[PDB]
Structures are given as C-alpha cells and as structure tokens.
Amino acid sequence: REFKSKNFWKAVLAELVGMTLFIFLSLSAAIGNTNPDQEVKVSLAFGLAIATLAQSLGHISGAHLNPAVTLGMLASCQISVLKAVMYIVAQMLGSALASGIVYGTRNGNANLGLNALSGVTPSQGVGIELLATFQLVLCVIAVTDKRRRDVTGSAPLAIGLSVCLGHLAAISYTGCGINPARSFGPALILNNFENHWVYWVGPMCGGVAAALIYDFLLAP
Amino acid sequence: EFKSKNFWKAVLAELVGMTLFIFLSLSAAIGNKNSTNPDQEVKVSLAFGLAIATLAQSLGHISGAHLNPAVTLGMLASCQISVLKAVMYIVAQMLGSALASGIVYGTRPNGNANLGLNALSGVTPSQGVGIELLATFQLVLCVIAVTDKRRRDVTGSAPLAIGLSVCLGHLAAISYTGCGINPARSFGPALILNNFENHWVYWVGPMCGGVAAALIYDFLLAPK
Amino acid sequence: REFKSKNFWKAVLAELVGMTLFIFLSLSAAIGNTNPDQEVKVSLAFGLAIATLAQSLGHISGAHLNPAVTLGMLASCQISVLKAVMYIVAQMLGSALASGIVYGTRNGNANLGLNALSGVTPSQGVGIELLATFQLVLCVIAVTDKRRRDVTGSAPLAIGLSVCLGHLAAISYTGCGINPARSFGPALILNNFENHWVYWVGPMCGGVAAALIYDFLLAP
Amino acid sequence: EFKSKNFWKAVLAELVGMTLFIFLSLSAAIGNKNSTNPDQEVKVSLAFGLAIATLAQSLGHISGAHLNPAVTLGMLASCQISVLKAVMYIVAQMLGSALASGIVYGTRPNGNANLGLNALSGVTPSQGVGIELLATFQLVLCVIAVTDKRRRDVTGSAPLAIGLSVCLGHLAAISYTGCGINPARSFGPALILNNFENHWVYWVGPMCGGVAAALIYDFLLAPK
C-alpha cells in the first residue's frame, strides 16, 4: 500500500469535495418540488454539475466524479490501480454523505433521485445504462486524449453535455444512473438496493468498452 | 481507396457513432411517448443535438463525425472527401441507424405514432421538402463554414456549434415534419418499423440542402 | 454612391442569405404548434439561430443580422455608412422574404412571431426593448473588440446566448423584438404596424448607447 | 485607491453590469408571474445564468464582472483584489441591483409572491443557510478556479462556465429558497419592495460560501 505523494491525497480529496457538491446539487434539483415534465430540469442540473465541477477541479484530480469514468481511465492506463481505488472510495463516501443531507431535507417515496426502473426489464436496463455510459466515457477519454490539438472548446462543457445527453436518453427508462457512486448514495440512505446491480454492471462495462473501442480499435 | 487504415477507421467511427447517435436520440423519442407539447419538442431537440455535440467531440478526429448522409454529401460537394469515402460513410450511417433503431424498438413497443419517425404534421409534401431543405441547409452550411481550414476566428467548440445547429433545426422543423435533416436518422426507424411513407421527402430535402449549402458557401459566399 | 468592391457585395449578400435563414427558422419555431409554456422553445430557437449563422457567416460579413447591431457597429466606426445602409436593406429584404414563406405555411391571429404588447404601455415597452437590446449590442461590441485577447470561447455562442437572454427577459412584455428588421417582416406581411415604432426606437437607441457607453466611457 | 481610472472604470462597469443583470433577471421573474412549475423553474434559471454569461463576456475585461458581493468577497479572500476595490464593488452591486429592481417593479405590479424575491419554500432557515451556502460555494469555487492565472487548460468560454454555474445554482436552490447566491440580487427587490424577511440568510449563506470556496481552493485544493 503506502500511497503517500501529497498531491495524490489532494486528488482524492478533490474527488471527495466535488462528489459531495455534485450529489447535493443534483439531488436537490431532482427533489426540488409530475415527473415527465420535470425531466428537462433534472437533465440540465445533472449536466451543469459536471460542466462546473470539472472546470473547477479537473486540473487537480481529473474531475472523474464517476466510478465508470474512473474505470475507463484505469482501463486506458492513465491512472494507477491504487489511485483508481482511492478515487472510487472518495466518490462513494462523498455521494453517501451528500445523499444523507439531501434526503434529510426531504414526496413520500416518489424520490426521482433514486435509480429505479420504469418500463424496462433489468436485462434491458443494463443495455440502456451501458450505452448511456459508453457515450459518456468515450467522450471523456476522447476529449482528454493528450494526442489531440483540435479540442479548442470547453472540454468540461462537452463532458457535462454528454452527461445531460445520457439523462435525456435514459431518465425515462432507468432514471439514468451512468454513475455507480451516484446510484449507491440514495440506495444506501434509503436502504433500498432493489435492482441496484443494473446500475453497476451497466455503467462499468459501458466505460470499459468505451476505453477498449477507443484505444485498441478506433484511435490506436 | 479500400485499405489504408485512416479510411477504414473513419468508416468504423462513422458506424459506431451513428449507432450511439440514433440509440440516444430514439431513446428520447420514446420514453414518455405520449403528448407533443413544447416540452417534449425542446427535449427531443436537445437530445438530438447533444448526441452530435458529444459524438463529434468523441470521433471527429477519426472521421470528421458526419453521421449524416446530407453532411457527407455536402462535404463531397466541397471536395473535402472522395466519392468512395462518401459511399462508405453513407453505408455506415444507414447501417448504424438501422441497428440502433432495432435496439430502441426492442426496448420500446410497436409505436402508434412513436414520434421517432419523421412524418408530416400540418404541411404538404411540397412544403415539407422546403422545410427539411432549409433545416438541413443551415446545418451543412454551418458544418462547412466552421470546418473551413482557412479560418482562425473559430475559437469555440465546433462540435458544440454543430450540435446546437441540429438542435435549432429540430426547434424549427420538429412541429411540421419532425425534423429529419439526416437521411440515415429517418431511414433507421423507417426500416425497422417498415414504414416508408413520405420517406423521399427526407432524402430530397436534406441531400439538396447540403449540396446547396456547399455550393453557396464555396462557389459564392467564401470562394476558393 | 458607386459602392463596388466585390467583397462588399458578398458582405451584403451574406447578410441577405443569413437573414432569410434566421427569420425562416425562428418564425417556424415560434408558429410550430398556450404561449407562456412555449416561451422557452422560442427563446432557444432565436438564440441558436444567431449562434449558428454567426459561426457560419461572421468571417464573411460580421453576421450582424440585426439593424440595431449594425447601428451599434456604425456608431463604433467599425463599418462605413454605405455598408451599414446596404446591410440594413439586405436584412429588411431577407426578413420580409422569409416572413412571407413562414406566414404562407401558417392559429388564426395568435401568431407569436409578431411583436405585440402584453401588459405594458408603449412608454414601458420602449424601455424594455431598449435594455434588452442594449445588453445584446454591448455584448456584440465587447466580444468583437479587436483590442482583447481573453476571448477564448465561442463568440457567436455568446452573442446567441445574449439574444436568448433578451428573449427570456422581454418575450412576456413585448414579445422581444431587439431586431428592427425582425419586427418589420411579419408587420409587413400581415400588414399590421400597430405600435411598430416601439420596436424601432427601443432597439436602435439601445444599440447606440451600447456603443457610446462601451467606447466613450467604459473602454476608451 | 480613489483615482486611477482602471479602478473607477471597474466600479462603473460593476454598476452598469449589475443594473443590466438585475433588470434582465427580474424581467424573467415577473412576466407570466403565476405558477411555479418546472418550466418556470428552468426559465428563471436560464435567464439568471445567461445574464451573467452575457454581461461577463461584455465587461469582464473591465472589472472581472463580479456582479456578486459573494464573488467579490471570494476574490478578496483569494487576495486578487484590495479591500477598497471590494467595498466599492459591493456598493456598486447593491446600487445597480436596487436601481434595476426599481425599474422592473415599475413595469410590474406590487407582487403578491412575485418570485423575484428570494424567500423560503419548504425549508427552515437553518436548512436555507446550508442550501444557499453550498449553492454559492460551487459558484465562487468555479469563478476562482476558472480564473486561476496558473492554468492553461481553460480553453473554453469562462463567462459561459460562470453563467452555467449560476444556472446550476438556480436549478438546485430555486425550489427551496429561490436561489439567491448573490446578496445584491436578493437586496434589490427586498429594498424596492421593502420586505427583508429572512434576508440575513441570503447574506450569511453566499458570503460564507464564497469565503469558504476561496479558502478551500487556495489554502487546500490548489496551493499558492
């Protein structure tokens, strides 16, 4: 073990603080006040949280704030195993901590901030979460490709808009998890892990393939 | 030609990107299916635009991220690609669109009106061709002007500009024709659902709009 | 007179083609299908039309597409009087031409694409249009200030978002004109010039002050 | 100090920009006044964010475009401005907010609930302070991190990032507290309407959130 490296602890700490802010703001927007109409607001808040916290903390920790993105970075050999494990631990702790506050301020059980299923089987929910996270991790890896000089725009904005796209595509079927750490928090605070594995198998593989297709196939 | 990896990886990027683009856009098309109220209008516009704004930022360095036979034809008219590259691009776009449509219609049901099929809502085909043509003209004109390698004033996110152009074409054409501006996007669901009613409108419109945007930008607006 | 200069005719022509596309797409979005809910859609379409046509034609004509912006540029001495007059003529012709098509494809008289008044006197409507165009022309002039090197973002996107902001602020009071050429088209095709001067005095002065406050006061 | 034009033009830019910011945001607050449905929620978020995303792009080269006493205090905690500049900034922001509020409430009526006044909707003041504090913490942290002159990875539109941060703070706090994250924005209407109920929440929240964001970014996250 023996991590050390003072800047590495700040990377893990930036992931923790950013995950707390990310989950607090996104769940506070979801639980704000039917749901089909509210979907647009929820998508915008979840995208802008990434588009802001990445622009604020990417130079300090890469601003993953997503275990699927962290696994996509680990599959691309851009971080170490120890750094990825500590990243996921910090993201899960920040997500549970912020989830406790947002579910403390709280419509009975409506709670749109809990990844459930709405019209799809778990076998289909895994595919929906997998493609909705594949596009996200592919965007994160391609936009952070150090071999490119054409990215003259806001990369955190591109990643946040990718999250918002995954929401626009997956919030009506599975609530759009695309973030195992964001699906654990509410499931831990409410103590409801029904169909929770769908929001872990789906995103993670979607991230891993996003690395493998990008590196070992698309852009060698 | 038919070997150099830079061409085949471009075709493969077109296939993967078109599959992701159509899957993500069609997943927004169904979902809450019912009601065509302005909030659904805006949401569908946003999803269809952000799919480009993400997949272009992810695959443009590999294939230009056309994901649109009208954009591919506009690039062919601008002499930026070859005919063989355009043919393989259009085939890849149609295949990716049909495949993603098959998956989305596997998760969704039959689809009475579905809305994920570009149809007509209050306009004749003579008017629908004009609406689709101008809505694709602005898109291909934007793509060619923003990717003009003779410009140094483009200091913003070009995939974001193209995605916002798609979103604008939706905001302007989704209530009349559903906004196709992509023959492959209008082909996928029409192939899986086996419904090609007024399908020629969404090929004549986009293709001619892209070729005209190319000629007006190059042969008129920005010469050479 | 004798304009000449081949590139100047292309500047006027780019203004004409861009104005036709701008008015067609924006009015087609407004007349698409109550109104308070539709406001968001109308604002987005009107902002994205600028954010796209500027990114497509600014290197060819500056992409004014707005007589208030053209007057703000003329007050800043960035264009000539002949070029500004020809610009306004091209914008008015393109607006009337596109307005004829959009009002040809057309709810009785609802027509949100016609600048009317909804809860404000003309004396107040002039102030609303003036500030809503002041912010726009100020943004256009400041973002196109050739003495700045900090503008590392999409300037057409900033201008389009300024238009969208003017819509979010003025569409419920006056319908948000902030464009004398965009207020003339529908008023000419429908032959209804009631309170039309409000949508000319308001924006123009709002643009002129935007120049004077920026140059002769804020940034000399 | 109290002479050099670069300081006074900055204060004047703060005044003009705050007047435009509050006028444009409050014009969105009234308008259709009634109903607090998610579409009004999103629309108010967009107007309040785009006002920053435009006025910052217009006046940041002249004054940094704080337009927020919490952002000004966060910059003072980051030692990027002096105390005199911060005092003149806060005075200019309060004056511009009150003036624009007077104009907007001249075009609008009395305002039963108005919504253009940051109040409480389902949370205690102890919870409202936390919501306003985190919603301003993210904003000031973003402003300081994106304007860190030691970074070269900020290749996007910084005023757009700050405006989207304001829009996010609205999407997260407008249903609980109306989203203040700007003491001057919460002061203007409260001064013109003469209603300072729970006004201290929208000063303790934003100010402390900005100072904490400055200390956490500088003294912890990004040293030196």
Author numbering:
A (entry chain A), C (entry chain A): 2 to 34, 38 to 110, 112 to 225
B (entry chain C), D (entry chain C): 3 to 226
What do the study authors state?
To investigate if the conformation of loop C that is responsible for the cpAQP1aa extracellular constriction region is dependent on pH, we crystallized and solved the structure of cpAQP1aa at a lower pH; pH 6.5 instead of 7.8. The low pH crystals belonged to a different space group, C2221 instead of P4212, and diffracted to significantly lower resolution (3.5 Å). The lower diffraction quality is consistent with the differences in crystal packing; the crystals grown at the lower pH have considerably weaker crystal contacts and higher solvent content compared with the crystals at pH 7.8. Furthermore, in the structure at lower pH, there are four cpAQP1aa monomers in the asymmetric unit compared with one in the structure at higher pH. Because of this, structural differences can be observed between the monomers, most notably the fact that loops A and C could be built in their entirety in one of the monomers (monomer C). The two structures at different pH are very similar, although some minor differences can be seen in loops A and C. Nevertheless, the part of loop C that allows the formation of the extracellular constriction region (residues 114–119) occupies a similar position at both high and low pH. In particular, Tyr 107, Asn 116, Leu 117, Gly 118, and Arg 187 line up well and seem to be able to participate in the same hydrogen-bonding network in both structures (hydrogen bonds cannot be reliably assigned in the low pH structure because of the limited resolution). The channel profiles, as calculated by HOLE, are very similar in both structures, suggesting that the extracellular hydrophobic constriction region is unaffected by pH.
